[PDB]
Symmetry: D2
Subunit: 397 residues, 4 copies
């Protein structure tokens, strides 16, 4: 009901917003039920979704209507994904989007440079613990003027006309925002190595100057990345495509460096997970078993090197496997095997039924688009985790 | 929580809307709890309140800030009241307002002629059973152009610069809108008897031409009213001040004619309740006992003659007693006596505690503003009812 | 330049408004120059267009993007027309549109029942002389609820999913709004003779009760129309399709009853122009010559508009509207020139064609058959003769 | 007339915008006429003002209505100023404001942290040459979170509850945005020398890393400033209060470091103008004469603005700003005239006073002490000499 009561109570300012609801709210409400969120938080997150996210989602692509802006975040072209973060004992719901501006994909705003900032400006008046300083920093570092954006669109596919995209964790009672920034556009227009802009942009952060542990960690990473990535201006995998940050106090925020690569295998998994033998402790290795097992039980691959200040030691990345094009029925079973392997019996026994329940307009045995990415993680304190990124819209036709 | 979760989830577009919430949402949420509305309807009605009513409420009058528009609906000047309709076994929650336009009280819109229509235009896209035909009819009949509105403001007190105000019943799962239209402005500017415009406006309704029962009832009423009210253009009590309609299919809607009067006593109660001996059956009389008892157990008085099509027989009115200036503690006790008298023991045992619970920022023993009006009613099928109109804001300082 | 300064100063809230301006504003500006509107009035009217009309125009239909709402006001489906009203000595510019609501053509608003009322509500705060009472009246008499609107859409072509459209006279420093209301939807849904509801709705106007001259004129018109139009619920020509009003003081507003009809010839022109021999004065007959001459000098219905002002019991000849959808605009240009000479309007004759080319320079008139859309003709006792020409701006800009 | 046509065409979304226009637009229009801006540019700039600036101005403070947010940019508390920049031969018009957000001065937005960024975001869709990278940079370096903003408000007068304000050059057909960022809030909250953060924030600019000339110029400036300003967290004169930038390509933008100071005299003028004997060329010294003469010809701080462009290692004399709040505007008019004669600007001298009266006709200049608010003076090698005069429009309209 909560999605229905809110539709009933709030209606819709235009038809596209209505279409968004009708293809994402039921699933979202479902996901929240399945994660054992309370009714009050179901309303909280859905009300929020309605007010702030619907308008940010732009037009709804569909037969007959072709937006000027087209997103990479999904197969149909829609700037939305819902993911979950699965733990031993709990599941968290997360939203991913690009906030579409009303002139995006036109001369006036080729790369959708404004809307994500506008969304967050609103979340800053809404939420008390939201912080725009890291955003503003990287936006300054990797943003482009109109003429530059225009150039960038002549050398990029329609799907990748973008500098920034946004995430929202529905964590505890809260909305935690995260933004990821693309270096590729600037790299292309300035003809600058991606490595160079990535670390130039990072080295100029306020946090960086005042936190020697971080500064150290970065060096470890630079030294490991330098040989593995291009030292010229090519877009040759593996590359430093994305920079990610949490929209909170800079000192407390994780700084994420992401690699994009098409070639993945056992040696490379190892190379990435351990940073070229740099990591060899028990945990690093227990986590390495995880990931190899997952790969055996089975768009670029993605390696995410996350870094928190007041900490000089790097840690294993999170590794992200593309699933686009692979049957969702098989994946459902795969993930169940792997959940059993991890000793997550509850998660194994419910995954597939619940998956069906998230996306009832579809038969997963015949779809290859709904599971889009999956990432895996190992932590010392928190231990293991899996993030699964779904294409809500694909799962709602 | 529901008022808090929605504040948390939705925030506020400007400060005035925030102030409205902080002085009306808690009370509203409370009232709904007390009427045994379900959580899903608590959210429904509160979400709706947030989206559509907050913006319509205009500025929030307060020390330091004096809106150009000032409402008659409340003591502080705020265009809002919450009322309840108390039955034998149940209670319904109702909202009353004027929808403030962004230029209201200025040259461009002296009488706030537009905002109520704009609100309802939105409720028409929201709700499927909302109907604007009766509105448009009476708005056409009693509305005024800019120059006329300007004139009307030079001959009316600041509190009465208005043609229309709106009501919303939170009934079952629904929002049922009602509008009341003021004849006084047109009467003043056109120097036309109020009686004449009131019935001229009524006689030109589509329903009227096609429904001989109604046409008959109206005649009974006209004949009864004609001697009791002014036949010239004065504003002399009793007068035909307000015309009211339900915003549904014209055939199904109750047409309400309201009298305003300052002189009330036992004979006049009788005169009004029975329409000058016209009504003498058992029910009319059982209802007459009710009302005399209520008056004994204790702004103009108000008499509301309601009329439905496909029905030629008039019925007793609903009579409305002003409470402004009378201690709310006394009234609380009064209403309890009268609830006991009616054999509504449950309602008697809870009124005062619940009243305190609606308005905890206040001590009712010392306030004379919170209970504002009270109306009483008798029906054949539905039987007896009491509507109590509160000044939420007054009850929230 | 004025259209370009305003584009420079205001930009656009979204792309559709940009497209609308890009296919629309140059022409509008040009038309104003050609009509000898001052620079300050050019800005006035273009600024107004930007703020108030662009947002009302909805999406801009175009390859790849198919709005949910499709308008009958133009060939491409765009809810916009620019017309002009030509006199002996002066020309004035007018705009015609439907104001598109954001849910128009969907379950929530099938017949676009709200947007025009919103636009006018905004003109009511803008302009001091705008009056919504007649609009509200006919919107009450002829408007439909959601469920009704839905029924109506299952019996009407996409192009006619509409109750009302709006017009705006750009007349001597001001914007005069007019609205036209369609009787068809309510006819279909209620299964009621169009005649009966047209006149029921008119017979309940406040004006009508307090103005016996009008009450009379109306009777004349009915007496003439009754035999000529269906007495049943059919939608058969000639029919009372549109009721029109000026959005000003009711006592000062013209009430307009429109007929649609496909069959037109010389006996019929005469019949409509004179109201069945009822009119025989010199002016009537000079007007008849005017009109007949126009028909001789030359798919959508013909339109007859019977206008009536209050405090007047005597009917007057209608204005007759000729459809030009499908006929070469190169010919029409030449046709209109002959007729301008014939009327003794040498200046208008010597300019028409060149100035037409100049309104619509992305197009060859010689090749197009959709730019000139209508043309109406009028005789008045005082003002004299008048030609209104309705263009399809968008059609003239692709 | 242009201000009146636009009011006629656009009306107003709410009353505050109306009031803003009614106390504001006549003057602006007049200033443009006096500066010989063409009619089309008058419309351009006034149309732009209507659409983009009015809504940004927030409520209009006035008897009975007390906004939650109170601005330091004017005497009445209104966040608006019109300035003018006077040359030998031409004058240009500029606007200064804070863009007021709808929760500004409340828990949710104590320091008005968002509205200027929103305004610029809208200018970025409007104008092609607007660039937000420097803005974003300093907003990152010098901006504060909600809790921080709250702390800052408990140590600052209502009038200074602000991080940023905005300016707009109406220069040869375009709108050039500039923003100024206040270092004080972050100083107070972090308890950090203003000097240290001013230069930390500057030392992290992208430009700075890739431009050794700038890196150098900056060093010169620091070397001069270091001894002259506090080395502790105090807010004591002279202080590095404002960092300014032009919202264009970083490589092309002037970085401006402002000093505030209450003590000014002839040794100090010299000291600031030359940077402690560091500058001794002919131009420097002719500028010094210019300035000294101005001080001789004559409560808010004095302002020194050190501007620096990239690809330039050599500093240049600042522009010095004299507060005029409290001093009769009748005198100032006469004062400015002397000085115009002294500069050899006869035309500017012969017009100033009359044209001033003409900007502000609801007022007697003779009687007012708040309309002229600041005046800054400048010497350039190429452009030459320059006077910027900052007016309080609202103060000149009540
Ligand atoms: C005779 O033509 C018309 O009245 C209309 C509407 C109109 C009216 C006035 C005006 O200045 C511009 C357009 O002009 C059109 O292009 C067009 O399609 C009109 C119209 C209106 C209603 C209708 O049933 C058919 C056409
Ligand atoms: C020297 O004066 C100024 O820069 C300001 C801001 C300003 C800047 C440019 C412009 O065209 C108009 C106003 O003009 C004012 O009226 C005013 O109050 C300004 C200002 C800015 C910041 C500050 O700390 C004090 C004043
Ligand atoms: C570069 C490629 C191909 C994929 C990266 C995918 C991506 C942006 C993952 C973010 S996971 P994230 O939302 O950040 O989850 P947590 O940090 O909380 O573990
Ligand atoms: C004219 C005076 C003084 C008071 C009238 C008060 C008023 C507008 C009452 C409406 S009661 P109402 O909301 O209409 O309740 P029901 O018809 O459902 O019984
Ligand atoms: C029903 C058909 C086919 C045509 C009617 C066309 C119509 C609504 C024309 C507008 S009449 P109008 O613009 O109002 O012209 P004027 O009376 O101002 O001279
Ligand atoms: C800190 C104090 C007291 C004054 C500084 C005043 C200030 C911000 C003036 C604007 S400088 P600006 O408008 O940018 O003038 P130009 O450099 O364009 O000649």
């Amino acid at each position: 009901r909560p999605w229905q009561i809110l539709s009933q109570a709030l209606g819709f300012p235009n038809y596209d917003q209505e279409l968004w609801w009708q293809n994402t709210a039921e699933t979202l409400n479902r996901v929240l039920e399945q994660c054992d969120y309370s009714v009050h938080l179901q309303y909280k997150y859905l009300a929020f979704y309605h007010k702030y996210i619907l308008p940010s989602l732009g037009p709804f692509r569909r037969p007959g209507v072709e937006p000027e802006y087209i997103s990479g975040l999904s197969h149909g072209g829609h700037p939305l994904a819902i993911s979950v973060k699965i733990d031993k004992s709990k599941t968290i719901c997360r939203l991913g989007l690009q906030a579409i501006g009303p002139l995006a994909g036109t001369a006036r705003d080729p790369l959708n440079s404004f809307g994500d900032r506008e969304l967050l400006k609103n979340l800053a008046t809404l939420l008390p613990h939201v912080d725009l300083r890291l955003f503003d920093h990287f936006n300054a570092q990797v943003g482009l003027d109109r003429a530059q954006c225009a150039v960038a669109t002549t050398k990029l596919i329609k799907e990748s006309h973008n500098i920034v995209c946004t995430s929202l964790d529905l964590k505890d009672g809260e909305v935690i925002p995260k933004v990821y920034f693309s270096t590729i556009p600037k790299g292309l227009v300035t003809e600058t190595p991606l490595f160079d802009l990535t670390f130039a942009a990072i080295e100029q952060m306020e946090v960086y100057h005042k936190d020697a542990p971080l500064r150290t960690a970065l060096s470890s990473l630079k030294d490991f990345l330098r040989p593995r990535v291009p030292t010229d201006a090519s877009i040759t995998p593996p590359l430093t495509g994305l920079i990610g940050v949490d929209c909170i106090d800079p000192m407390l925020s994780r700084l994420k460096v992401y690699l994009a690569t098409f070639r993945m295998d056992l040696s490379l998994i190892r190379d990435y997970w351990t940073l070229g033998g740099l990591l060899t402790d028990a945990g690093t290795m227990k986590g390495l078993e995880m990931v190899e097992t997952l790969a055996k039980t089975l768009l670029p691959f993605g390696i995410n090197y996350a870094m928190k200040p007041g900490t000089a030691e790097l840690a294993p990345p999170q590794i992200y496997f593309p699933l686009l094009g692979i049957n969702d029925g098989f994946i459902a079973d795969a993930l169940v095997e792997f959940f059993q392997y991890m000793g997550w019996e509850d998660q194994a026994n419910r995954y597939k039924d619940e998956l069906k329940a998230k996306f009832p307009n579809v038969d997963i045995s015949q779809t290859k688009n709904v599971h889009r990415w999956l990432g895996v993680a190992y932590s010392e304190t928190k231990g293991p985790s899996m993030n699964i990124y779904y294409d809500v819209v694909a799962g709602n036709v």
